[PDB]
Design a protein around this ligand. Sequence first.
Ligand SMILES: *SCCNC(=O)c1cnc2n(c1=O)CCS2
Ligand SMILES: *SCCNC(=O)c1cnc2n(c1=O)CCS2
Ligand SMILES: *SCCNC(=O)c1cnc2n(c1=O)CCS2
Ligand SMILES: *SCCNC(=O)c1cnc2n(c1=O)CCS2
Lengths: 87, 87, 91, 91
Amino acid sequence: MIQVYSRHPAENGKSNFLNCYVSGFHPSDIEVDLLKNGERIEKVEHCDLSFSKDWSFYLLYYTEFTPTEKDEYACRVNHQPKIVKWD
Amino acid sequence: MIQVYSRHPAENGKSNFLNCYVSGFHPSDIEVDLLKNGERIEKVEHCDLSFSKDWSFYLLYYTEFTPTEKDEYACRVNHQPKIVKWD
Amino acid sequence: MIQVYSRHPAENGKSNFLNCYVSGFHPSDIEVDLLKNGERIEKVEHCDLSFSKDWSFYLLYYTEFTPTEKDEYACRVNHVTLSQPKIVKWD
Amino acid sequence: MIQVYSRHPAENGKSNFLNCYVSGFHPSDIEVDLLKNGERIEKVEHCDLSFSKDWSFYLLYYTEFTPTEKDEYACRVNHVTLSQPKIVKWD
Ligand SMILES: *SCCNC(=O)c1cnc2n(c1=O)CCS2
Ligand SMILES: *SCCNC(=O)c1cnc2n(c1=O)CCS2
Ligand SMILES: *SCCNC(=O)c1cnc2n(c1=O)CCS2
Ligand SMILES: *SCCNC(=O)c1cnc2n(c1=O)CCS2
């Protein structure tokens, strides 16, 4: 499960936060990235939560950004990787 | 940081939950256990939370138990291990 | 946002959990309900997280259910913001 | 429970965070405040987590502070349960 969204609704030229929420199961060699116009963003902060009861994990990758008319943002998940754009 | 407590206040003979909350920093090869009269309890459930922003982790180890007059419970943390009794 | 989903993938006849995740700003007059064929379910528990700094809130409304082909499940959210309460169907 | 602690170990003169963690049952008339020398701090934000299933609640009240030897910091909790409001000092 992958959900991509901005902390606040977007005004171009106003600093904001982009978020990728990811959920899954078991032990797993999964990796996550935020993209700007198709290239990986570096120093992306995350939040990792896991529960032994059901081998479940919950990940939120987030970054400061200033949304612009030009720029295209996405979130990508590999180990094949699945890309979810923001809108 | 280690905090040991029962979900509900204890009536002997009533099923309850014992909890060990542990907090720390950085990457780390730390391990955690709940003890009954000094021996490790098996199949103990946990909750692991970590944040990249400050290399911080937060762990809650919990188990069903029926508190008794006889039995002594603790939480132990190694990698030396530090033992915190419940009361 | 509002997201409706089953804990595990859905097999008709098999016990599962239905979840309504709702996130926003100014909890305020926020009400959330899970419906089965338009009627409120009484098994419904929830998990409320809120932060004072920015009046941000995160809600999970959940219940045990046994999904069937005939049955329709939905989540209902009403807020000062919305002209009319919002219904989000599942699958 | 009530636990008062600094985010990082305390160096006099150095910016830090003070935290008051409060957990219980029936949030109800729960009020929580951080004091500096007996006076409420206005920088105070909080993080509220609650579950309907068992009326269980987990609160973190926090603020930026610069600890000094002279200054006394505390957390104050009042509840229907308590005869009188409880003050827990830090360190
Ligand atoms: S992940 C555990 C609680 N923290 C957050 O959710 C969190 C913390 N800091 C920041 N964001 C968060 O979502 C993103 C914008 S700043
Ligand atoms: S750790 C994330 C949220 N879950 C809990 O805190 C949790 C879940 N289930 C059970 N307990 C919890 O504390 C212990 C008794 S049952
Ligand atoms: S009540 C806190 C546990 N749930 C979540 O944090 C949660 C669950 N589902 C989804 N998100 C969450 O943050 C991300 C978007 S959908
Ligand atoms: S607002 C949720 C983040 N804080 C905690 O979950 C938390 C913080 N500090 C301590 N405990 C927590 O659960 C365990 C006992 S002290």
